[PDB]
Amino acid sequence: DKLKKIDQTIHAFYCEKAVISEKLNEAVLYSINAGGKRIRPILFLEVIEALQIPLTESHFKAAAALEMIHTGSLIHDDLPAMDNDDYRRGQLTNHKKFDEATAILAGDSLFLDAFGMLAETDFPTDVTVDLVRSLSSASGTFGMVGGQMLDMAAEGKKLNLKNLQLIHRHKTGQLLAYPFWAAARVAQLDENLLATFLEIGMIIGLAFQVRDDILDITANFEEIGKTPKKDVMAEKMTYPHLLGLNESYQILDESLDQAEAILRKLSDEIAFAPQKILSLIERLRLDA
Amino acid sequence: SMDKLKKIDQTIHAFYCEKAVISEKLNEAVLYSINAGGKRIRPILFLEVIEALQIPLTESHFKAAAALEMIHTGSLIHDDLPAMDNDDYRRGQLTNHKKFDEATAILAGDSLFLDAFGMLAETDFPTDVTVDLVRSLSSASGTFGMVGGQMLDMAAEGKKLNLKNLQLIHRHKTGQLLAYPFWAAARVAQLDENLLATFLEIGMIIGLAFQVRDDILDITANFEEIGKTPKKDVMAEKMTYPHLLGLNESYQILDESLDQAEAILRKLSDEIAFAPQKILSLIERLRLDA
Numbered sequence: 001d002k003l004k005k006i007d008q009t010i011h012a013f014y015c016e017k018a019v020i021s022e023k024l025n026e027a028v029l030y031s032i033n034a035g036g037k038r039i040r041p042i043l044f045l046e047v048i049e050a051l052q053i054p055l056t057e058s059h060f061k062a063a064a065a066l067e068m069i070h071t072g073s074l075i076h077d078d079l080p081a082m083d084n085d086d087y088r089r090g091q092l093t094n095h096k097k098f099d100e101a102t103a104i105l106a107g108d109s110l111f112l113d114a115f116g117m118l119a120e121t122d123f124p125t126d127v128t129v130d131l132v133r134s135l136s137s138a139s140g141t142f143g144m145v146g147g148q149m150l151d152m153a154a155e156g157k158k159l160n161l162k163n164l165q166l167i168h169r170h171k172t173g174q175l176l177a178y179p180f181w182a183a184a185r186v187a188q189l190d191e192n193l194l195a196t197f198l199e200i201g202m203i204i205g206l207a208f209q210v211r212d213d214i215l216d217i218t219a220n221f222e223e224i225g226k227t228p229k230k231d232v233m234a235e236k237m238t239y240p241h242l243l244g245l246n247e248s249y250q251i252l253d254e255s256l257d258q259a260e261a262i263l264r265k266l267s268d269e270i271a272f273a274p275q276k277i278l279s280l281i282e283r284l285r286l287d288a
Numbered sequence: 289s290m291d292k293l294k295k296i297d298q299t300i301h302a303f304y305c306e307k308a309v310i311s312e313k314l315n316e317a318v319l320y321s322i323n324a325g326g327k328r329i330r331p332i333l334f335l336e337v338i339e340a341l342q343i344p345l346t347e348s349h350f351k352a353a354a355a356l357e358m359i360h361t362g363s364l365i366h367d368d369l370p371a372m373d374n375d376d377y378r379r380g381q382l383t384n385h386k387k388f389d390e391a392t393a394i395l396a397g398d399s400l401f402l403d404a405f406g407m408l409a410e411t412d413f414p415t416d417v418t419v420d421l422v423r424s425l426s427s428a429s430g431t432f433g434m435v436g437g438q439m440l441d442m443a444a445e446g447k448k449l450n451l452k453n454l455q456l457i458h459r460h461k462t463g464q465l466l467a468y469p470f471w472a473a474a475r476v477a478q479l480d481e482n483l484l485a486t487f488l489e490i491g492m493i494i495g496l497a498f499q500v501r502d503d504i505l506d507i508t509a510n511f512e513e514i515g516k517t518p519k520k521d522v523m524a525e526k527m528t529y530p531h532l533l534g535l536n537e538s539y540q541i542l543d544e545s546l547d548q549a550e551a552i553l554r555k556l557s558d559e560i561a562f563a564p565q566k567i568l569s570l571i572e573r574l575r576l577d578a
């Protein structure tokens with residue numbers, strides 16, 4: 001239902017204006033339709049719902065904007081000059097399906113279009129401006145793209161945990177923290193609560209990358225939908241490479257536990273029903 | 289008042305230096321392309337329209353101008369890439385990917401796109417104004433604007449198409465981000481719908497004209513003049529104005545387009561509190577002779 005509606009919202013954005021380049025629209029939609037867990041938009045919508053706010057088309061637009069930036073980031077991450085994968089979401093990567101130019105531009109479209117999507121909501125305009133500012137912050141030079149540069153620069157280097165945390169909190173952490181913070185902001189919560197939601201999001205965001213690192217070296221192709229073990233060949237700074245699998249599994253499980261405990265704590269202090277968020281977090285757990 | 293070019297660049301610099309650095313290499317790559325050069329026509333036109341409308345310039349106007357220049361800059365970085373136009377030179381210097389590497393250039397362009405909206409949301413404009421500016425800048429830049437035009441441009445390589453299809457490419461890849469500063473300044477000025485449409489119209493005329501001009505320069509001017517490799521359009525079999533219509537008719541179209549834009553601007557000056565002399569002088573600097 002949420003899943004279906006998120007994809008409807010994205011399809012609507014691309015199919016309700018007069019088309020300029022049919023090939024561009026097709027390339028953008030290819031990557032969207034290839035698959036994806038939709039964790040980021042789902043979390044935004046679940047927090048709104050948990051905070052007792054009926055979901056509207058505007059919430060789905062805000063959620064879609066977040067997913068659009070996430071999708072653009074994947075398309076560029078996969079490119080030959082970056083991680084160079086032939087597969088994403090169980091299908092050919094955008095650049096192998098089409099060509100590199102098309103993939104570069106499809107990613108660019110998603111980044112630029114995302115802010116138009118976000119600006120189409122019926123939220124109060126002060127809310128919208130804050131969401132735009134924060135989404136830029138999470139995504140750009142001081143967020144995801146900054147993290148991506150650090151990830152590429154760390155290849156083959158012996159970095160420490162602080163530096164590994166810096167990569168992971170930025171390349172992945174920021175865009176998983178944003179949906180928690182953004183939902184709280186739309187709910188117009190006070191500063192203390194906005195900080196607690198950002199904290200939960202930052203814990204989930206770092207844990208998600210620890211999880212992604214573990215899966216890179218433990219899972220098969222069918223399970224992850226991308227070529228396994230690229231992190232090893234590329235000499236990426238990762239949790240397993242720095243700390244080992246045993247510690248990485250412990251950190252993932254502890255982090256997920258902590259996020260859940262903070263969520264349950266909130267429900268003692270405000271009108272907040274986190275059961276769906278808790279269910280989603282449970283589905284992220286791994287077994288060695 | 290202040291030199292606009294220097295203030296625009298200082299505004300962009302401050303955006304990158306006012307927050308704790310995450311990747312120094314990224315900041316360096318972004319600023320390299322900004323600092324390489326550029327006429328800054330897009331942000332200058334926005335600022336000139338604000339001033340022509342008798343509005344004193346503020347930090348916020350420079351931020352909005354800077355955001356536009358950031359998107360424009362990101363578009364050049366990606367346009368130069370090996371998978372796209374494959375130029376080794378831009379703004380008289382090595383292109384971003386030849387100075388650094390392909391990955392760096394991809395990410396530098398991505399940064400500029402994503403950062404631009406953060407820049408725009410830093411203004412002190414009324415929030416309803418900012419939301420409209422964000423929506424419109426996305427429209428001008430994305431799948432229905434610049435990027436859409438970029439895809440059409442690559443798809444038309446080696447293809448014979450008509451004027452209609454050539455205009456579709458040009459209006460979207462270049463027209464929209466030259467139309468935006470006119471529309472956006474009128475929007476910040478809070479002009480009525482009719483005036484917003486008139487300013488957009490002026491900008492679309494100037495925007496289409498600027499690409500005709502660019503097409504003409506790519507085949508008539510040398511490397512020293514344009515700061516990029518001449519004649520790339522020819523070798524890659526791009527659809528251009530001189531190819532579709534000949535050089536003579538292309539010069540004629542440029543001149544008459546710039547005439548048309550100037551006429552609308554003069555008419556507005558006879559109707560509202562608007563003083564476009566500096567805009568008109570900028571437009572005159574865009575003229576070419578055979």
Ligand SMILES: C=C(C)CCOP(=O)(O)OP(=O)(O)O
Pocket residue numbers: 035036037038039089171172208209212
């Ligand atoms: C680890 C990161 C940040 C990239 C993959 O994210 P996901 O694992 O959420 O990818 P999809 O489900 O969207 O394919």
Ligand SMILES: C=C(C)CCOP(=O)(O)OP(=O)(O)O
Pocket residue numbers: 073074077083144148171172212216226
């Ligand atoms: C912005 C991104 C893609 C962060 C996750 O990095 P990875 O390169 O490990 O993600 P996957 O390709 O493994 O999904």
Ligand SMILES: C=C(C)CCOP(=O)(O)OP(=O)(O)O
Pocket residue numbers: 325326327328329379461462498499502
């Ligand atoms: C839209 C086009 C023709 C790309 C180059 O734009 P400019 O000719 O304005 O480039 P800079 O001055 O910014 O270098």
Ligand SMILES: C=C(C)CCOP(=O)(O)OP(=O)(O)O
Pocket residue numbers: 363364367373434438461462502506516
């Ligand atoms: C979005 C852009 C960059 C439009 C100009 O494309 P061109 O490829 O014609 O411009 P130059 O490289 O000649 O500046």
Ligand SMILES: [Mg+2]
Pocket residue numbers: 077083151
């Ligand atoms: Mg990567």
Ligand SMILES: [Mg+2]
Pocket residue numbers: 077078083
């Ligand atoms: Mg990757």
Ligand SMILES: [Mg+2]
Pocket residue numbers: 212213216
């Ligand atoms: Mg990975």
Ligand SMILES: [Mg+2]
Pocket residue numbers: 367373441
């Ligand atoms: Mg080009």
Ligand SMILES: [Mg+2]
Pocket residue numbers: 367368373
């Ligand atoms: Mg080019």
Ligand SMILES: [Mg+2]
Pocket residue numbers: 502503506
């Ligand atoms: Mg050109």
